Design a protein around this ligand. Sequence first.
Ligand SMILES: Nc1ncnc2c1ncn2[C@@H]1O[C@H](CSCC[C@H](N)C(=O)O)[C@@H](O)[C@H]1O
Lengths: 189, 121, 202, 127, 32, 58, 144, 72, 125
Amino acid sequence: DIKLFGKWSTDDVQINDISLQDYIAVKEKYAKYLPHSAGRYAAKRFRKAQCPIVERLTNSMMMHGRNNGKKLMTVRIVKHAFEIIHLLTGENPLQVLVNAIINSGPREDSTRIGRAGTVRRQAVDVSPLRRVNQAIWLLCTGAREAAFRNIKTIAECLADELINAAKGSSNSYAIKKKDELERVAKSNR
Amino acid sequence: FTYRGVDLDQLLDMSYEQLMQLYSARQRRRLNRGLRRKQHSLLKRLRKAKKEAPPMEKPEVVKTHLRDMIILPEMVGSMVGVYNGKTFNQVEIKPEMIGHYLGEFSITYKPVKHSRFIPLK
Amino acid sequence: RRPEHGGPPELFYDETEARKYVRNSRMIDIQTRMAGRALELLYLPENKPCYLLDIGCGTGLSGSYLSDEGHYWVGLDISPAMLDEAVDREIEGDLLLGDMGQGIPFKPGTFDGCISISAVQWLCNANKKSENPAKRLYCFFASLFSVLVRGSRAVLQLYPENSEQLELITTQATKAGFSGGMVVDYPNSAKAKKFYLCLFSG
Amino acid sequence: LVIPEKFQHILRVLNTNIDGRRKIAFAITAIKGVGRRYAHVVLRKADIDLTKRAGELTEDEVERVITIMQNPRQYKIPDWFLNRQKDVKDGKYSQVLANGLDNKLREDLERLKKIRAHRGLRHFWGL
Amino acid sequence: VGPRLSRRILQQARQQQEELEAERERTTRLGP
Amino acid sequence: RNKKHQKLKHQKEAEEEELEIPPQYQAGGPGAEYKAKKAKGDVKKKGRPDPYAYIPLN
Amino acid sequence: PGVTVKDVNQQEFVRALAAFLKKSGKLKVPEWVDTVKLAKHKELAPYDENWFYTRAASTARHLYLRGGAGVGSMTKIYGGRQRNGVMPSHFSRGSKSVARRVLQALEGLKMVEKDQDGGRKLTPQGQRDLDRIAGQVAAANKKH
Amino acid sequence: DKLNNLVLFDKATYDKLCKEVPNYKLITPAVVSERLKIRGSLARAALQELLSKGLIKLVSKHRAQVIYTRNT
Amino acid sequence: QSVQVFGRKKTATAVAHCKRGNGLIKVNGRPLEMIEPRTLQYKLLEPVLLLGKERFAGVDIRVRVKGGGHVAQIYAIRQSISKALVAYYQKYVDEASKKEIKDILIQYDRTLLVADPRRCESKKF
RNA sequence: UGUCCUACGCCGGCAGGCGCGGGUAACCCGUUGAACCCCAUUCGUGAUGGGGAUCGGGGAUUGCAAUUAUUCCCC
Ligand SMILES: Nc1ncnc2c1ncn2[C@@H]1O[C@H](CSCC[C@H](N)C(=O)O)[C@@H](O)[C@H]1O
């Protein structure tokens, strides 16, 4: 049985949203030992739907300059995050990861159009691929700008953000930004 | 006055070769590398200026272009004028001047000493 | 790339953005000398007490500059976080919470001068379907021409992202009766090119 | 462990205040004339536990470390490691710490002003 | 592969062959 | 290339204002002297105040 | 059958060899052991007070892995990154005198000897001691 | 505003640590430092001491992050 | 009986020699389980875990690795061990095991047997 | 890339100094023991062990000559 970090199973992982079964790739073919693969999942369109989702978090925590290219640090970060989220919650970390991804992707966006001076906003639907991408981006931004100047490490803030977006409580950053975006989309039908 | 715990009288009586250790590293390297003909030339000229002076007041002024002399204790009390590019600055060599170059005492550049529309209609 | 594209000012100017605004040295320095230029750009007479509006007050450092010069002022803003940190700054003048495009709630013949800092550019685009920038700008400019003393002056600082915003703002200003022009401070510069719409009632 | 009964929150050494709630090896650096390197070498010559905090040193420890920073050459702290190596007026190796640093600095400025070299004249023309 | 990488691979394999095959003064006089 | 970019961005701004003017008249009733020839910037003069621009409103 | 140095964890091996050379107590400790930085790119003195035994243990291991290393080679080995102020960083070597004193102390313990073609290399008896301490590391780790 | 984290054990702080830390379900230096208002280095020292007395279970060790939790 | 194969990455090369043995894995003379980055340790260990230690119990391999960086060297090593086992079970063991094992590697990861031909681009004046 | 690149030995804490070899070069520097990275220690939200500007003292080196700081090193 292929296990994340040698101790995390993907067989009991159940994805709830119908919209994203092809776009959250973590199952018996997408189960990997490690979120490092040196994969060329971006040489052709829609290839990144075949990327395992922990590798997508690992690729999306290498941000703001100093951390670019440092992937082993990020594999370490998500590993320690999985241990601490399992200790704090008491169940499979990957399940609340996919839960926070599903509950963090916005379902209705706003586009800005304009002709000359008059600039207005029209509400439009979202692709499932953009749903997963925006959920990953918002969770990474939430953890990153959550810590940045405090005693709490990056892994603890990532796990707390991942819990707080998994259950959907309003103290999470990602669910707040998603609710703001859905509100402006509802106001700009 | 004293310089590194040494008084001027025996400083004049000290040798050329073991005065070298009393100075800083730049001066010691310069004294390692010898002095040129103009150096002893102006040394002889300032000595001649000191010799022909009446013993009550300061000797005459000796002027030069040569800015990279190190002030030695021989020169203490002399009346030296150094070209700063346009004019000559005349300065008395004090005992406190014992380590520096002459060119520090005639600066070759001058200090730099360096309304809104309101609508009526 | 720009704050305007974030959305409505009630959502881009939340608590976190307010706390990054109050702890920002460049904001303090630039907006302070903009308040200086704004107060010097209307020819209100020297040694004469005057009453001013400071709209788009946000932190009230523009209000702190007005109170530094001895003058009293009324602050108007749309974001609650800006007014919260402004009262936390212990500013001298009185604040008020309300949208400027809906209209300024003051009686006519009131203020000796008006100063607006980085706020009129937000009325050039519509972030709601009920919103219409042309009528909103017309209402806001007519409210200026109402609540101001006839013959007073209003300086309106902005950083227009293109000339369409200037076109619409100037058209809605000239159709509200306002006479004046544009002081483009350091016109051909880039880091100091600041647009000041200067207006008066006759 | 727990706070000692003689934990000193504020220390008064060399006419200068010391914040006692810090590691000793940087509470030493809190005054002028000593940085991190000289503090570490002083503490290693003095045979003091650098893991220990500053506020729990006894009077014997503070008096011996003050003694060592006044006369470092006596305690085999080398000549090259010192602040003032050759004083211009009286050639000797020392380590000016609290007020002597300011003294030698301002008298060097007055010396450069009296001789009218470029450096002193430019420095006093800078203000 | 290309010249450079194949050259490095070939010399590396040759050195591995010699170190697998791996696991006194010069003859100063002519006649014993 | 960025030169022509900036230059005719300004030219479009001027043309848009000049085409705003006639319907403004109907429905109702710039640093060239401060431009430096040697460089991009803004050079002070003594006869006139600090560099500025006045575009009056009709 | 005997485990070598190359058969164990290197950090535990270095720490155990440091404990070995400390309990031997016959290395010539320099008089300036507590007042030097190990290279010009350092910012502080080494935080571990008996750093000399650790450095000598690592030096012995490095000569075991690759013979013919002089003082210059060991300064290249322990070189790092100098942060040149507000200027870009660079690679800087170690301090030559520390490496020389470690090598001469190891020769004084007769663990290390010269060769005809260059720098220092391991003695057979020191190599036996190194295999012994490597076996001690393997027993203390792999059998635990 | 300015945090005033304690550099050393107070008596009440030490007692509260000894009888409230061993039931948290998550033991890291950061959580003890933030919810006890103590300096994080001494938080690490206290966690190491609690591990040394055989009362708290270590989960994973790193130079970057160390995590402990309850025995039972 | 023995074979010698190679794997590669950007510049990292690994040359693997595969001989009859008892199940000890050497890379640069050092054991497989002690290569410096532990965070990529399972990336080093995937062929053994997918195939089982029983398929390695009657064979030994030694790999010399030159070039590249840490991660590139690890990827070249895992390509080398996979190609070495495939070549050995092709040449001296029956072909059916070689084909099923090759299928297992290529369904898990193509880069275990096919080189990634990505390198740094050149800059032209 | 190299008749200034440099191995190695000795001295000094460091820049550096002395001697003795190789290289007109896939032959020697060089199996170019690079840095990020990886593993342990200290640090704990503090203009603080972040950040290094600007200065004070001394040493060394290239030059006919370093003053208006050539460059480097230590505090
Ligand atoms: N339509 C509108 N009505 C009222 N206030 C508005 C507004 N659009 C923008 N604003 C206000 O414009 C401000 C921009 S920030 C200005 C801060 C101020 N110049 C200072 O630095 O002191 C915000 O406080 C925002 O709430």
